[PDB]
Design a binder for this molecule. Structure first.
Ligand SMILES: *[C@@H]1O[C@H](CO)[C@@H](O[C@@H]2O[C@H](CO)[C@@H](O[C@@H]3O[C@H](CO)[C@@H](O)[C@H](O)[C@@H]3O)[C@H](O)[C@H]2NC(C)=O)[C@H](O)[C@H]1NC(C)=O
Ligand SMILES: *[C@@H]1O[C@H](CO)[C@@H](O[C@@H]2O[C@H](CO)[C@@H](O[C@@H]3O[C@H](CO)[C@@H](O)[C@H](O)[C@@H]3O)[C@H](O)[C@H]2NC(C)=O)[C@H](O)[C@H]1NC(C)=O
Ligand SMILES: *[C@@H]1O[C@H](CO)[C@@H](O[C@@H]2O[C@H](CO)[C@@H](O[C@@H]3O[C@H](CO)[C@@H](O)[C@H](O)[C@@H]3O)[C@H](O)[C@H]2NC(C)=O)[C@H](O)[C@H]1NC(C)=O
Ligand SMILES: *[C@@H]1O[C@H](CO)[C@@H](O)[C@H](O)[C@H]1NC(C)=O
Ligand SMILES: *[C@@H]1O[C@H](CO)[C@@H](O)[C@H](O)[C@H]1NC(C)=O
Ligand SMILES: *[C@@H]1O[C@H](CO)[C@@H](O)[C@H](O)[C@H]1NC(C)=O
Ligand SMILES: *[C@@H]1O[C@H](CO)[C@@H](O)[C@H](O)[C@H]1NC(C)=O
Ligand SMILES: *[C@@H]1O[C@H](CO)[C@@H](O)[C@H](O)[C@H]1NC(C)=O
Ligand SMILES: *[C@@H]1O[C@H](CO)[C@@H](O)[C@H](O)[C@H]1NC(C)=O
Ligand SMILES: *[C@@H]1O[C@H](CO)[C@@H](O)[C@H](O)[C@H]1NC(C)=O
Ligand SMILES: *[C@@H]1O[C@H](CO)[C@@H](O)[C@H](O)[C@H]1NC(C)=O
Ligand SMILES: *[C@@H]1O[C@H](CO)[C@@H](O)[C@H](O)[C@H]1NC(C)=O
Ligand SMILES: *[C@@H]1O[C@H](CO)[C@@H](O)[C@H](O)[C@H]1NC(C)=O
Ligand SMILES: *[C@@H]1O[C@H](CO)[C@@H](O)[C@H](O)[C@H]1NC(C)=O
Ligand SMILES: *[C@@H]1O[C@H](CO)[C@@H](O)[C@H](O)[C@H]1NC(C)=O
Lengths: 175, 328, 328, 175, 328, 175
């Protein structure tokens, strides 16, 4: 949608991630793994529920109204009784049709946004120690075991701890 | 600083989102079918088929319309002094008493339907000089002839029908509804046989209003043995006002007043069965749940109901776009 | 790799977007004139000026209104048994027969206009004791006097006008529309000359309804030589019901029934020329194209038309912002 | 608009680009050159057409309605016939006015978005071999002939092929 | 380039946004209370309490309703030929002349209310054979009896009430409004005492229309000493048409015509004080300012007013989210 | 909101910034300082006023209408007069309620956007001489006195002037 993460630079979803809406997959020298990110999952979920509750907010009640079905032909007054109702129904149907179109459009950009925000957040944390492979994956240029992967995920990763190892691996090489 | 010791390697971390095998199509500002992870339906499109008898007070009219219950057709005597939040009228209802017509039937049915009560108070009208309680074989009450329970057909006594001039003050603090009528005979002979005068006249008035109706002699189609008709009228009398009924023939007199109230009552035409269940929204197709915001069951509703919409499905996306690994 | 890859040069790559010299201003949530590359107009604001005679069946009333075509004014005899999707009434239409008035003209014009047919079936009413086919010099049919083709003016035979009491059953399976009327004479002399009785009366009824009208003698303004008037009424008779016409003077009798139908027909007042072209949307200003979603030509429409809006222009941006590179 | 590419960090449009809505101009070894990008052009065009078709979706039809012009003065009932229509027209006019304002607003951010997405996509592909000059142009720090420019544009550019040449040119210099 | 910068240090630059201590909660598509820096109220919910007498021409009816001002109740003679943009009717208004009723009161009050003028032109009707200027002690004008200033009660001359048949052409180029009426006596004796004939009749017509009303004898409730009533009617006569008034008893004749116009006038029921101030929007609760888009003061308005809405507050965010740094 | 700057990577606002909506706080060789940014403040303010004026655009005027309060009970016609008004009021109330919800939602993303745009703009200008600390602060890796801070803020900063000093400080170190 507007941010180009979902169905964008992230090629496709993971049918296998059953524990959250957004998450991480990694491959290091100790193995491969997957893990949902619960904060961005909750952020997306809460906004969609907020939106949902606003839409289901109070059915108003109406009691005696006007007749809407007639068995005899009467002319002028019954023509008006029918026209008031038919123009009321088209106006409420327009409203319903526009409301879900705007809402759905926004739900797709909102979830695209949370994906991109989690990507950016992880980018900012890895600092000079990783490079973006451009497909939603970072190449971490230093040895990062499963506790290192866990610290990026739970947001406690210290880039300084691995900066020189990373900068060496990343740049120096032979050019 | 941190000392590597020996190892020199890299790791890969990839961010991603879920996807589901199934997925639902939804409309958008720019697409009209785009597939998302999950959606929720906003249009209620099915009734239970039964009018739940709770929380509103449903009154099933059985084979009485509300006007016949009001007038007091013998077969609707079950409804006297009855009350309702919703009066349900059935397609099978039939009238079976003196043939009548109501000039503005639709406003009288409305006006009683939202008052919500058929509470009737009998008042001591004194009709001097005429024969009270006339009844007809087209309105059988029991083995005998009869008439509407709430109306009083006056005819001559002996050889005269006087000019009736009666009054009934509204001394209470509420509005009073008076239902009265006029008899249209089939023949001039019938007119004089019953009312002596060859031209009747009924004038009912208050300080605020007056109706004078004069009868119309002529043959109408045979209905339950009769070609005559009575036409029904109504007068509301406000607190402090006074009713004066003045006639010289053909008056079908009131027996007292219905009392009027202000409430949430209405009337509905439906053949749906009433059943025991609680449901706030009533539709002539039966109750429907008001959990969704819009409904497509019927434009006629009573109670806390979803807004009727022409569409029968409107799905609200409750998840991200579905971009599966394989296909859909 | 290579060996000492020494060529130290660089390149520049710039991303950009197009821009146009011209560009269109559009409204926005935050700006009311912002310039974009291209836009499309959503309000239709011009008619062709002609009512296309296709796909709807347009009936041009020429100098007949629909009610005169119905009643059978001599000069509108062209329209007998005619049908339409849209009947166009012209401002030039004129009546030219016995001066009449229709108590609820507006409902009779509506009710016939959407039935969409003037199909008339003559029925064998037998009027015994009166002179049929009365005609007037204010309603010339050919050289002679005449009257409305679908109405039958009954007057006395010899010295008496009996009490007419006729009946016509609806035995078919459709509703029947009966147009009848009552004559209001100018003088008591005219009343007795024609109808003998000094006070006429017409009662038309079914099992469901009844109308009794009594005439009113008095001078009205001279219209085509006459101060008298006839007033038009209508009765619909449902399948299985029965019409009973009972009168004692002044009856302008029906000659049979119009048949009623249910459809998409309507009536429109317009002096626009009808022309050959296909157009779905008709406006009294002529047809308009329903390609745009909103229109500002006229609030009166018939057919598949854009929604009338007060605005005469609403441009929908179909391109990005125009940020020109000079402007040429 | 929301992303700040169009009428933002990209100073102005190119009146000369007649073959697409978004594209590339380059100046290299063989000279200067321009080329439209057809994928982002199509992405912008398709969304605008989708939006367009939804707005032109079905004019509903109406046949017998109520009278809307009157020649005599009648009072209570005609007052209501006029009031029903006048409140119907104001409601549909409000709807038309709001609909094009939201739509236009969104068309401007949507196209701003596609510009920025194409910029980001090119950024991600050039990896460590280019720098953003901050005006929508990348400085490519290695020799990049016309086929090199065409591989960035058609999305097949391999950064590794030029990484050491680039990293040398870009960093080393004298600081 | 430059020489040895001995020291090589760093700097920190941080971007941020403001925040306020206070902050306002607003609704959102996804939240219904989110705190922003500032907001503005879009619902006007309070009146001044006074109807500003500017820019519209307010006419305070004091203790006259518009219909009594029209008819010419003695106590409303102040309003003759008066004009208004808005006529304000007060709850205290009372009638104090001959007891009358108006069959379609609501349309006559509407029709005069938007014409906006009580300009009356007297015309030379010649009533030959009857006694003009009848007056009553229930309509005291000064010490004496009186009647409505704009109506003329005709009774017999000596022993006869002729058939009146008068005509008044509309030769001007504007529509004329004629208010006329009919007297309903209480007794047949009253009928013959005044009008000789035992059954009156009034027929008022133009080329286009006709009304025949016949009186109705009978006792109504005592109002200002009387049981009789007069009912009010109206006829508009278009340019080039002609009025013909024909009666044989009970006519309450017009004295001329009110002239009709087309404008922005209306009528309002309010007990709010009129005051001097300029305000475009008038509400029966007093004027309100139309600076906001929506208002919740009253659904009744006149002038350039905000759209009435059920909500009493709707805040539009005019600032960013408020994310303060201290605790609470 | 959609961009994740306000109430996002920028932890909280400054109650102390009284001179503008968006701005800078630095620390450099010469001391500490704060300064509002007036261009992004004006950009946010203008859009919010534009939006505001559109909403207050013309109260339409209405003169003779239908009666809306009745003292007698009449039945069919009065039922319609009441139903026309009650359905008109619910439709306008729906409109008011949706209008401020969309508007407010957009005002929060629009201001989130301007924050992020000012951040990006500063990023692009500092080029290879600074690093993002990920909290909305850049670490400038070269000596930058008050006039240097002023040139970043007023948009005239030349990165080349400090590139080698910065690149040395930033990378070389000991890895
Ligand atoms: C005026 O004309 C109408 C229509 O011709 C007459 O109505 C008909 O009157 C007869 C005799 O009363 C009715 O007959 C009865 O019908 C019932 C049902 O079939 C039956 O039980 C009786 O044995 C008898 O046959 C007939 O139904 C009725 N028809 C209609 C449509 O009303 C009316 O009598 C005439 N009146 C005068 C005073 O001439
Ligand atoms: C009741 O009063 C009305 C109005 O004064 C009388 O109407 C007028 O009657 C005369 C004589 O019939 C009409 O005259 C004819 O007019 C046409 C056109 O000018 C002309 O061709 C004839 O030679 C003749 O002059 C006059 O038009 C008519 N005016 C109106 C407005 O209707 C009516 O006759 C009176 N009736 C009685 C019984 O007293
Ligand atoms: C028909 O019946 C009505 C109701 O019974 C009669 O009305 C009543 O008539 C009397 C005598 O005229 C009225 O008396 C008046 O009372 C007022 C005080 O309220 C007093 O000021 C007068 O001097 C006089 O005494 C009485 O008010 C009136 N009541 C009503 C409700 O109208 C009427 O007279 C009867 N008519 C005939 C012809 O029988
Ligand atoms: C983050 O992960 C590391 C490794 O598991 C652990 O030591 C640390 O405590 C974690 N922090 C939190 C807040 O979970
Ligand atoms: C789909 O959305 C609805 C409403 O948010 C929710 O009740 C339902 O559980 C969701 N489905 C799944 C599989 O989460
Ligand atoms: C109806 O209710 C009234 C008021 O309590 C009572 O006097 C009357 O007798 C009741 N009649 C019947 C049939 O219940
Ligand atoms: C509800 O009832 C109406 C009329 O009885 C019928 O046409 C309609 O299709 C029904 N809809 C449902 C969901 O039962
Ligand atoms: C402008 O937009 C309309 C609708 O998308 C399209 O038909 C037209 O060709 C466009 N103009 C140009 C120059 O592309
Ligand atoms: C009108 O149509 C009916 C039905 O077919 C027919 O009997 C009648 O004679 C037709 N009359 C004319 C004038 O066409
Ligand atoms: C359409 O017709 C009406 C009335 O005839 C006129 O006022 C209006 O301006 C016309 N508009 C167009 C586009 O012809
Ligand atoms: C991309 O460009 C290079 C140089 O023209 C060419 O060899 C390569 O095949 C192109 N790939 C595609 C998919 O066009
Ligand atoms: C809040 O917003 C309104 C409308 O933009 C403005 O008049 C008011 O001055 C604002 N408040 C502050 C403190 O800026
Ligand atoms: C009312 O105005 C008319 C027209 O100028 C005038 O002839 C008439 O005498 C006026 N009457 C009063 C009481 O002002
Ligand atoms: C306005 O007046 C109505 C009726 O007089 C009253 O119910 C309402 O509360 C008043 N509102 C205000 C703001 O005065
Ligand atoms: C930017 O700041 C520097 C230092 O104050 C100053 O020399 C320069 O002229 C400033 N430029 C502008 C446009 O303010």
């Amino acid at each position: 949608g507007l941010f180009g993460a979902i169905a964008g630079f992230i090629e496709n979803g993971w049918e296998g991630m059953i524990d959250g809406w957004y998450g991480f997959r990694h491959q290091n020298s100790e193995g491969t793994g997957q893990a949902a990110d619960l904060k961005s999952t909750q952020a997306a979920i809460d906004q969609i529920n907020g939106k949902l509750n606003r839409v289901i907010e109070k059915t108003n009640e109406k009691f005696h109204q006007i007749e809407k079905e007639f068995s005899e032909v009467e002319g002028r007054i019954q023509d008006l009784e029918k026209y008031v109702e038919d123009t009321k129904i088209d106006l409420w149907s327009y409203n319903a049709e526009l409301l879900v179109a705007l809402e759905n459009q926004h739900t797709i950009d909102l979830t695209d946004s949370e994906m991109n925000k989690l990507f950016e957040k992880t980018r900012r944390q890895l600092r000079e120690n990783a490079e973006e492979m451009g497909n939603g994956c970072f190449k971490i240029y230093h040895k990062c075991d499963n506790a290192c992967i866990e610290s990026i995920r739970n947001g406690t990763y210290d880039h300084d701890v691995y900066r020189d190892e990373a900068l060496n691996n990343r740049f120096q090489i032979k050019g | 600083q941190d000392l590597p010791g020996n190892d020199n390697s890299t790791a890969t971390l990839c961010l991603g989102h879920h996807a589901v095998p199934n997925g639902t199509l939804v409309k958008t500002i720019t697409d009209d079918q785009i597939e998302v992870t999950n959606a929720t339906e906003l249009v209620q499109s099915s009734s239970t088929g039964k009018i739940c008898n709770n929380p509103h007070r449903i009154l099933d009219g059985i084979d009485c319309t509300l006007i016949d219950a009001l007038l007091g057709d013998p077969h609707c005597d079950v409804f006297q002094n009855e009350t309702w939040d919703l009066f349900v009228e059935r397609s099978k209802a039939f009238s079976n008493c003196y043939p009548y017509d109501v000039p503005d039937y639709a406003s009288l049915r409305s006006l009683v339907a939202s008052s919500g009560t058929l509470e009737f108070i009998t008042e001591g009208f004194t009709w001097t000089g005429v024969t009270q309680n006339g009844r007809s074989n087209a309105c059988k009450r029991g083995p005998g002839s009869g008439f509407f329970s709430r109306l009083n057909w006056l005819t001559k006594s002996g050889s005269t029908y006087p000019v009736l001039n009666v009054t009934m003050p509204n001394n209470d603090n509420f509005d009073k509804l008076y239902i009265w009528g006029i008899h249209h005979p089939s023949t001039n002979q019938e007119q004089t046989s019953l009312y002596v005068q060859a031209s009747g006249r009924v004038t009912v008035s208050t300080r605020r209003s007056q109706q004078t109706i004069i009868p119309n002699i002529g043959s109408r189609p045979w209905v339950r043995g009769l070609s005559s008709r009575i036409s029904i009228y109504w007068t509301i009398v406000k607190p402090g006002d006074v009713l004066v009924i003045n006639s010289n023939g053909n008056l079908i007199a009131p027996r007292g007043y219905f009392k009027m109230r202000t409430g949430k009552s209405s009337i509905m035409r439906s053949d749906a069965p009433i059943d025991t269940c609680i449901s706030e929204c009533i539709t002539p197709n039966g109750s429907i749940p008001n959990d969704k915001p819009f409904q497509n069951v019927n434009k006629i509703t009573y109670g806390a109901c979803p807004k009727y919409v022409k569409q029968n499905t409107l799905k609200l996306a409750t998840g991200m776009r579905n971009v599966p690994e394989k296909q859909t």
